[PDB]
Structures are given as structure tokens and as C-alpha cells.
């Protein structure tokens, strides 16, 4: 299945900032000039680098953005703001030999932690040694045999939990045994037969919920039946016909809403109705002609905004206001 | 002027939980049984103790609630959940000699920090030594000379910043010089002539904004004019005739909204219109007959919910749905 090709972050002064791989293999970025849904943008600025994955951005607990990418030497590289929303550090290597997009999250103690597929197809991770600070830990293996980019979320008890496509096409997960801990659970399978990266989110009632493209090209989901613990519900189809990984976000009223690339290469969405954890809507098309997975953020106004690579390789955007019309932010962007 | 008499926390499984002082001077709590605006409440459970302030509750970054109170001995006492949303430790003293409600915030490294007025009218503080865990640091003075209760917020660069009524009845502030620092700036005056505790919130564009009852009994506000920095706007009146401390929250679409006890002992509110930093609305009454400052929280549905001590000395609640009818949560509660 197709993968996400940008990340979006919310700056601490409330503006969205988008990171992509340019046609020159540099990381480029583009941001809203003002904190509002209909805001004009800066246009495209290079952060240089020579990269071969999607960039994954996270906001440090001191509000500096940090971007993680696979370099063309297959090491993990990072670049950070020197102060919130201000200038950038330049590229520093964190070593390793990686084969995926990095996935990033923040621990309860403010330390960033990065998960990758290694060249041995295990899940590997490493972390800041102190809140929002260098230096970083050594690389550590969590074993396994995976084929997806990993996805990571924090549980409602502070424990990170990672979801991957296994070599058997099942969904697998592994979690921290306590908040911030270097001791993880064994690998456990959630079964299923999947054909995308998984997407995970935390419901408002504190349960993780995971979304995948099944072998039948439908969207399927599975969720913790209690906060921060198994058992899981087991697999439920939301139907459709999709060709990307799904992406999921929480609306302002905490209904989940999922975005995919359809078989017709349009953007489609489906949502919980009425309230959080409510019964799901029909599938609805937002049109377009897209060649990536969609990426979704919530803006300062509380409205969802979606970013996609268009058939022309520009970055395009559409927002809750009916949704807005499609709007191009130009650029020449690539998939990895 | 009248103060807040409950504190409210958003638990990690999406339920509101209210703490108050009972007529027996113990701390009591009550919670939504499910994570919905529509939810029935548990009713009051005692946490015992013998207290002479409002309790202040905070959620540790590992999702365990923790409550801070002034004991009858004038010491700072705390009580914590042993697991998220599960059982309570019972009371432990952190010593000191305090004269105010405590105010608690979390640092960027996950360490709770508590701010009090000392017996010497100076601002004092102490902090967890590691993320979300005992032991605590020594008591330390940040000096100054203050009246009533402090208020604390985090800046959009992760620096804590505290606001107090000084003994000259101006608003004063003091901030960490760096995220998680123990080095604070000097005291600075923002002038004014106030007769309540201040309330502080962070706007969606990253600027702190403070609300106070002025000596004229109007609601006044002042804001950082840039993210995380002076100079401030200087004081502007939002008029009205109020007899409590104000409380403020952000709506789903990030319009700030302020709640007060009016001179007619009704609950009144006023909000930013159209968007975050659109012009303020007219004052509007939500009726009721109340004898405290209101306390506001956002529920899992993205809806504001307000708690007040009624004339019957029960706790009452009213919520965004046109607001709901008033609903009694019963109990027998007191101010200190
Ligand atoms: C630190 O170890 C190096 O990088 C890891 C991310 C793995 O790819 C491993 O095979 C390799 O030897
Ligand atoms: C449990 O069902 C299995 O896993 C799901 C994720 C889907 O791929 C379905 O077609 C497959 O048979
Ligand atoms: C505006 O610049 C265009 O888009 C960027 C994202 C890069 O692909 C660059 O090479 C290209 O010319
Ligand atoms: C606009 O109304 C004024 O302010 C409100 C907050 C109330 O105190 C009311 O009695 C007073 O007249
Ligand atoms: Cl299987
Ligand atoms: Cl003592
Ligand atoms: Mg299986
Ligand atoms: Mg003593």
C-alpha cells in the first residue's frame, strides 16, 4: 500500500508546518504564516540533507521542532530548531542501518524516542538520555521480523506501544512494561492479514485503536476493550476499497475520522457519528487525484486539515470549514 | 473576592473528576461514571484528611491523579493514585508553613511543581526530583510579597511562569529562565489594582493571557504581545460587575471563555467571538445562585462544563450542549 509522504506538526504558536522530501532529496518545509484554517503559507524552504525516507517531525516538550529521516548512508539523521519556531541546527547523525521511515514519540519524562525497521528487519529504537536534549542512547533491538514502517502511540498510563506489520502479514505489537522504561513486553500478535503500515490513535476514553488496509483492500480496525490493556476487540471491517495506509485523527468533539487513498485515487474519509466511539458513517469522497497516503492535522481553529501528494507531485491541502476546495501548495515532492 | 472551591481534572480515560472540601473538612471527590457530557456521576467519596484550603489536583504524566492541600497544621499535604484511575495512597506531608491554596503545574520533564504563599508572604515552591515520582526537593523561596493565591502556567517554550497579587495590589510575575530550570527571573510588576486571585491561560497562538477582578469589580485582562515574551499589552477592561476570581478555558475552536460570579450571585460568562482573538461578546448570564468562583473544564465531547458551590452548599454543574439546565451533584461543601 501507499505510505504517508509528509509529516505535519503544530508549532507552539499554533501554525501548521509541513515537511517533505524534494525532487533533490533534501528535506523541505512550508508553514502557515498565521495560526488559522484559511492561512496563507510561506512557500517552500530547504533544510538541505540527502535523504531516502519520509521525514518524521515531533515537537520537543520545550516546543522546538525536530525532524528525523533516513540518510542516503542509511543512518538515522536529525535536525532541530535552536529555539521554538526559530533557526535550525543542521543535520546530525544518530548512526544505525535503517530500512524504514522513522517513527517518533515522546516519553512521559519528555524524552523523544525513535523506532525504525533495521536492515535485519527487527524493530530498533533509541532515545534522548534527558528531556528534550542530546545526547542519545545507544541503538537497542526489540527483535521481531517486520515489513512495515512501525507506528507508535502512548497508552493512557504513559507506556509507549508500537504496532508493525509482521513478515506473516499479521498486526503485531510490543509495549513498555512501565512509563519511560527500557524494559518491554514480548511481541504479541493481533492476527489479521494486512497490506499497509498500521495507523494508531488514542480514543478520548483512553483506548488505543488501530487502522489497517486488509488483504481485501478494505479498511479494518481493532481496539483495546479497556484503557491501556488487552484484550483487544478483534477485527472489524469498515469496508471501502483503498490502496494506501489509512490515517486517523480526532475531531474537536473527539470522534475519530479516517482518511485513505481510494482505488479511484481520490481522497476518501469515514468517521464516528454522533459522539466519540459512535457508529461509523458511510464512506464519503473528497475527490482529488492523489498518489500518496494522506496526512492529517488539527489546526488552531479546531478544524482538520489534510495534506496529500497530488498526481502532479505538488503538495495539496483541503480542510474542514462542507470541506474547502482543494488547494495546491506547489512544490515538487517525492515518495520513498 | 470569592475564590474557586473545587478543582477539576480530566482523567486519562476521559472522565471529569471533582475535588472539594466537605463540611467535615475532609477532601471529597466525585467523577463522571462514563466519558460523556451526558454522563451520570459517581457521588462523593471521602479521601479523609483535615484541610483548610481548596484542594488542587494535577495529572502526573503517567496518568495518576495527585491532590495537594493546605492541612490544618498549615503544612502542604498530598495524596496520589497508586495506578491510573485506581486506588489512593493516603496522605503524606511535604512540610512547610503555608497560607494559601497550593497551585500545581507540570514541568516539561514531567516533574510536578507546587507553588504556595508562605507564612512569610513570599512565594515558595518545591518539585518532584524525577518525573512523576517521590521524593520531592527542599522547599525554596522565590521571595516577593504576595496576597491570596498564586497561579501558574507554562509558556510556549516550556518555561513555568507564576502570577500573584502583590502587596501593592498590582499583578506580578516571575518565570523560569529556561525549561525545567531552578533559576528564575526577577520579579516584575504588570501594574493594575486587583482584588482577586489572577487566572492565566495560554492562547492558541502561544501567548499567555491573564484575567483578574479589578478594584472596580470589573473583569480586566492583559496579554503577552508575542509568544512567550514581554512586553505585555497592558490592561484592558471587559467590564461587568463580579464578586469572584474569574476562571477561563479554551473552547474547541480555541476562543477563550471566562466565567465569574456576578454581583447578583448568578454565573456569568463572556467569550472571544468568531475566532481565537476575535472581539469579545456581550456578558451573558447562566443563572443559578452561587456562593463561589466557578471552575471550568472541557469534557471528552469537547464541551465546556462548569462547577460551582450553590446556595444549598451542594456542588452544581452546567454544560455546553445553548447550555444545559443546572444539575445538582449534591454533597455538602465549604470554602476556606
Ligand atoms: C546499531 O545497529 C545497526 O543499526 C540498527 C538500526 C540495525 O539495522 C542493525 O542491524 C545495525 O547493525
Ligand atoms: C481477520 O480477518 C483477516 O484480517 C483482516 C485484517 C482482513 O485482512 C481480512 O480480510 C482477513 O481475512
Ligand atoms: C519549490 O521548489 C520545488 O519544490 C521543492 C519541494 C523541491 O522539490 C524543489 O527541488 C522544487 O523545485
Ligand atoms: C453586565 O452585567 C454586569 O456584570 C455581570 C457580570 C453581573 O454582575 C451583572 O449583575 C452586572 O450588571
Ligand atoms: Cl494469523
Ligand atoms: Cl512541620
Ligand atoms: Mg495470526
Ligand atoms: Mg509540622
Residue numbers in the entry:
A (entry chain A), B (entry chain B): 31 to 351, 355 to 369
Please quote the authors directly.
The newly characterized lectins PLL, PLL4, and PLL5 were produced recombinantly in Escherichia coli and were purified by affinity chromatography. The PLL chain A blade W1 interacts with chain B blade W3, whereas in the case of PLL2, PLL4 and PLL5, chain A blade W1 interacts with chain B blade W5. The PLL is a tetramer in solution (sedimentation coefficient 7.6 S); PLL4 and PLL5 form dimers in solution (sedimentation coefficients: PLL4 = 4.9 S and PLL5 = 4.7 S). PLL preferred branched fucosylated saccharides (BLeY and ALeY); PLL4 and PLL5 preferred MGMR. PLL4 also recognized linear d-fucosylated trisaccharide (d-Fucβ1-2-d-Galβ1-4-d-GlcNAcβ), α-l-fucose, and lactose. The highest affinity was seen towards methyl-α-l-fucoside (αMeFuc), ranging from 0.4 ± 0.02 mM for PLL2 to 4.9 ± 0.08 mM for PLL4. l-fucose was also significantly recognized. For PLL and PLL4, only hydrophobic site activity has been shown, as αMeFuc occupied only H sites, and structure in complex with other potential ligands is not available. However, conserved ligand binding residues in most P sites in PLL and PLL4 presume their activity.
In this article, we studied five members of the PLL lectin family from P. laumondii subsp. laumondii TT01 (PLL, PLL2, PLL3, PLL4, PLL5, collectively referred to as PLLs). All studied lectins belong to the seven-bladed β-propeller structural family. Each blade makes a W-motif composed of four antiparallel beta-strands (β1-β4) connected by β-turns and loops. The saccharide binding sites are located between the adjacent blades and are uniquely organized in two separate circles around the monomer.
